[PDB]
């Protein structure tokens, strides 16, 4: 949509500012990226989602799909984190109140096998950690495939050496060219015919 002369090539500008030895530099040189196919490889790649989104945001800032992905991911992090905290707070409040009355849920061994920690302590620990792990697991699966496709497109662009801004990029007001609203219709003339 952006004409070649109206493109600011912000991605190229960021690429130039990158260090000499960088992964993006290698992709530009011709390095090809393949998503992991083994379970162990996928598990490792699960923790690289944040790094990929950040660099893509830097490379293609103002890109519609990338900007939308950041907004949705940030909102999901906030929504999931607060839900996890609320569940932990409610569960902790419930456990304490019933424990005060002498009622303890018969979950987990009463005493620890090694350090002898009491059941109540581990119930609090499990309540605090388990929802956090589920939140991380839930978020990663939702955005793992989406992030990989965005990373795959970025690598393909580098391999082809296409450092110009992609389609659906909307620059701020400063970088937007003003529109000429002065139009002078040509003088009317009777047709010779």
């Amino acid at each position: 949509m952006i004409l070649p002369h109206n493109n600011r090539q912000l991605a190229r500008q960021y690429f130039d500012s990158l260090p000499e030895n960088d992964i993006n530099r290698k992709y530009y040189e011709g390095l090809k990226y393949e998503t992991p196919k083994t379970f162990f490889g996928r598990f490792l790649n699960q923790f690289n989602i944040d790094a990929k989104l950040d660099t893509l945001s830097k490379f293609y800032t103002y890109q519609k799909t990338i900007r939308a992905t950041q907004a949705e991911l940030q909102e999901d992090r906030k929504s999931y984190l607060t839900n996890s905290l609320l569940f932990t707070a409610v569960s902790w409040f419930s456990i304490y109140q019933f424990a005060r009355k002498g009622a303890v849920l018969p979950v987990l061994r009463e005493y620890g096998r090694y350090f002898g920690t009491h059941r109540l302590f581990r119930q609090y620990l499990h309540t605090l950690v388990l929802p956090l792990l589920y939140t991380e697991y839930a978020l990663n699966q939702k955005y793992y495939t989406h992030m990989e496709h965005l990373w795959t497109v970025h690598v393909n662009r580098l391999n082809q050496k296409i450092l110009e801004d992609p389609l659906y990029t909307f620059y701020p007001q400063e970088l937007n060219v003003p529109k000429h609203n002065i139009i002078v219709p040509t003088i009317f003339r009777d047709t010779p015919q």
């Binding site: 103002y62 909102e75 620059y171």
Partner: protein, 247 residues
């Protein structure tokens, strides 16, 4: 293109209060054999409250329809820099006018059965007991008014049975095909596979972006080609402006 199709998802919710009343009425009729007047006033009162709720909804829609024909608008006189109120007549498709009359008849019928019920509840209170004749008559009134509530759903009938009318005679030799029954049995096979695949095979996810505004207003570009409606150039301009404002 003026098919006038109303969403069934919107229609069913509107239809809940009426079907609720007839079911309650039947239970009152069935339970009247072994129940007393005092105990059953809970059902009678519930029906009356529901009937009042439907009466308000009928009137509010009835009031809206009749108010259509008075076209009132504000006109800005630039010389005096004053807004003035003006009244004018209405011009619209006659199908809208015809259904309005049908909806007017529906309202008067509902006002009739409401007064019928109001008459019924008052008399049983004075008598001190309910009777099958009047109680059953009111229940059947609820059923009849419920049937008449589907008056404005006629476009779906035309949408279905108008396509049967346009089918020409077989031996005029326009297409030389009749697939009525063949489609009937084939669709049984297709629906059987469709349902089994839906609940046992891959189902595409429904996740979507919920936060980025105007994300799905996709302006034309190389990816989507340029075969859109011709006058969407303005739409692309507006979409471009909105994204700039967001960023």
């Amino acid at each position: 293109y003026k098919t006038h199709l109303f969403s069934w998802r919107w229609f069913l919710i509107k239809l809940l209060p009426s079907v609720s009343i007839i079911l309650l009425g039947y239970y009152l009729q069935l339970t009247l054999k072994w129940n007393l007047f005092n105990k059953q006033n809970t059902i009678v009162l519930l029906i009356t409250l529901l009937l009042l709720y439907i009466l308000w909804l009928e009137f509010y829609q009835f009031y809206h329809i009749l108010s259509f024909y008075g076209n009132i608008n504000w006109a800005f006189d630039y010389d005096e820099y004053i807004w003035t109120l003006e009244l004018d007549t209405r011009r619209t498709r006659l199908a809208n006018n015809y259904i309005a009359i049908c909806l007017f008849a529906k309202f008067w019928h509902f006002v009739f059965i409401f007064l019928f019920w109001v008459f019924f509840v008052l008399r049983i209170n004075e008598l001190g007991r309910i009777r099958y004749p009047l109680l059953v008559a009111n229940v059947q009134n609820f059923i009849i008014i419920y049937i008449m509530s589907w008056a404005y759903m006629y476009p779906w009938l035309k949408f279905i049975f108008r396509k049967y009318l346009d089918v020409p005679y077989y031996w005029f030799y326009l297409n030389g095909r009749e697939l009525g029954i063949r489609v009937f049995f084939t669709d049984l096979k297709l629906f059987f596979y469709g349902i089994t695949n839906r609940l046992f095979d891959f189902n595409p996810s429904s996740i979507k972006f919920e936060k980025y505004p105007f994300y799905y207003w996709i302006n034309s570009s190389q990816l989507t080609e340029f075969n859109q409606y011709r006058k969407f150039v303005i739409r692309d301009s507006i979409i471009y402006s909105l994204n700039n404002y967001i960023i």
